[PDB]
Amino acid sequence: SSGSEGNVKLCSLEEAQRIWKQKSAEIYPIMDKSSRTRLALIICNEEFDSIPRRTGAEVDITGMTMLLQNLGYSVDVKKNLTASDMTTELEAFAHRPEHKTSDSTFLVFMSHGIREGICGKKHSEQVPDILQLNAIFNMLNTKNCPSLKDKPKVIIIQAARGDSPGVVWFKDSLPTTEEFEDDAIKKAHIEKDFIAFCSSTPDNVSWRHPTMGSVFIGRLIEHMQEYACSCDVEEIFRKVRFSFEQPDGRAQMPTTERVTLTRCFYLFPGH
Amino acid sequence: GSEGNVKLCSLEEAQRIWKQKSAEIYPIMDKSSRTRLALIICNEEFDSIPRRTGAEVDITGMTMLLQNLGYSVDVKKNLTASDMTTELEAFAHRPEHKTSDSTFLVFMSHGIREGICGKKHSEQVPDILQLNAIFNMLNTKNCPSLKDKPKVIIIQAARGDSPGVVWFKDSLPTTEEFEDDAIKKAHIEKDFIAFCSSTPDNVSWRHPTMGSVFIGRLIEHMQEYACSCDVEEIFRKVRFSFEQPDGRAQMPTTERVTLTRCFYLFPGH
Ligand SMILES: [Mg+2]
């Protein structure tokens, strides 16, 4: 009886009716299932030139691919890219015409993390190869990705550190090209409707179960599958943090970051 | 009464919430015995950089709000980074927190890339309090009295001819202070939520010293919605209220959320 949705628990018609009746004015609207063309992007760096292999990556890619596909997203997976190539790929994704007939997107980045951003494949101390988190939000913003204006953009980042001070986030501050937008694109908020969810916790290896996925990605998939039907995604992220509250060996506490969501994002699995 | 402008949560409303989600709501303390503390730090008068007009209306608005929500408010004004740090460290050590369920910290100043401007700041010899330092001073190691309790941080840190007050990043030996092993095994940073506005100062001229729109909008939403919405959502709704821009676009961000539960203020209780 299971199908496109896999192991994601379905929101019944009754359930969906209730959520929408109660808060429709502040729920991101979703598009008709039959005609919508949802897109997602996973970029996973596993094999690196000068830094450790990320054993566990393939289980994560497979799990997140399955998850997002079960939630209705056409998932485009890219592997072992330089920051330069990650940039080129981001811009292409941002420019896909399918987003015009979509209601939302997910972007997943799985790689090594340092203070300054996400490590590309050719990264070393001498020769840097870093994707700045900021560039993700910029390339998907209102001006650079007008097809996703007013639509939620969920950015999941697994950027495990090791000895370094995780991923830094947060600051507090040439002229661009005139592309002659209608004054309603011009006057829109540059950045709006983003939510990020970030883990920089290193992996604990089990040699008995090598190849196995990161606990973060596993815990996220588990919670998405169980609670996509009843909770909006902000709340699902909070519940992942709740699940990690009593520490085991390796303490995990992923942070929700750069929230410019204006409405609740419900996934309405089954619809 | 003591709540004034804040709409009160009712016993039926308040029991509604609690029954629905008590296992995932931050518990609040008995009203008669809790001693809630909040801190406002505002730099408005500066040596070298522009005077921030309308600060006093914001201070007064935020103080009243926090008092209405059940917090005793200490306000500190025009401090160097060094003095702000001293004050924050003092705030963290107050015994009241031992008998409290939560806190709010408010920072209002000029902001740059590196963090919040202090009174003596110039681009020639900076004076900046790092946002990181705020979280560190209130974290589990350094402020054990607020472990497992919500710590709301509001930063109004207006941008100059500058790209912003940026956050984030992913990833010298400290003094050994002999913490209990339960403190050592605890999550170092948990139960925080920041709401940040980095919008520049436009100034009213026929009628000056009239508050900032961010703070006004936050206060209005807290008054309206504390009786039915957790702070997270209240912060969402302020964003919702700014969706169609006025002249000066404002979209304040929620940042560094390690909240594991929902923080209902339950005004009136
Ligand atoms: Mg919520």
Strand, coil or helix: B6: coil
* CA B124/CA B103 separation, integer angstroms: 36
How much distance in Å is there from the Cα of A232 to the middle of ligand 1? Answer: 7
Facing A171 at nearest CB: one of B167, B188, B232: B167
Q: The CATH number of A1-271 is which of 3.30.470.20, 3.60.110.10, 3.40.640.10, 3.40.50.1460? A: 3.40.50.1460
B165 touches chain A (CB under 8 A): yes
Contact B260 A241 (CB under 8 A): yes
Boundaries of every domain in chain A = 1-271
Strand, coil or helix: B77: strand
Report the residue numbers after which chain A has a gap, meaning the C atom sits over 2.5 angstroms from the next written residue's N, or none.
173
Instruction: Determine the CATH number of domain B1-269.
Output: 3.40.50.1460
Number of H helices, E strands in chain B: 7, 9
A133 touches chain B (CB under 8 A): yes
CA A128 to chain centre: 24
* CA B248/CA B202 separation, integer angstroms: 8
CB atoms within 10 A of CB B241: 14
Length, in residues, of chain A: 271
SS (HEC) of A9-51: CCCCHHHHHHHHHHHHHHECCCCCCCCCCCEEEEEECCCCCCC
Find chain B residues with C-beta within 8 A of A51's C-beta. Answer: none
CA distance A2 to chain B (A): 31
A119 touches chain B (CB under 8 A): no
- Bridge partners of B196? B155, B253
Find chain A residues with C-beta within 8 A of B251's C-beta. Answer: 189, 191-192, 260
Per DSSP, the residues of A62-121 read: HHHHHHHHHTT-EEEEEES--HHHHHHHHHHHHT-GGGGG-S-EEEEEEEEEETTEEE-T
Contact A242 B256 (CB under 8 A): no
Positions of E strands within chain B: 36-42, 71-77, 103-112, 115-117, 128-129, 151-158, 165-170, 192-197, 253-255
CA-closest candidate to residue B263, choices B69, B6, B98, B64: B69
Could you say which DSSP state residue B95 is in? G
A53 touches chain B (CB under 8 A): no
What is the C-alpha radius of gyration for chain A, rounded to an integer number of angstroms? 19
Q: Burial letters for A81-120: b for 16+ Cβ neighbours within 10 Å, e otherwise?
A: bbbebbbebbeebbebeebeebbbbbbbbbbbbbbbbbbb
B147 touches chain A (CB under 8 A): no
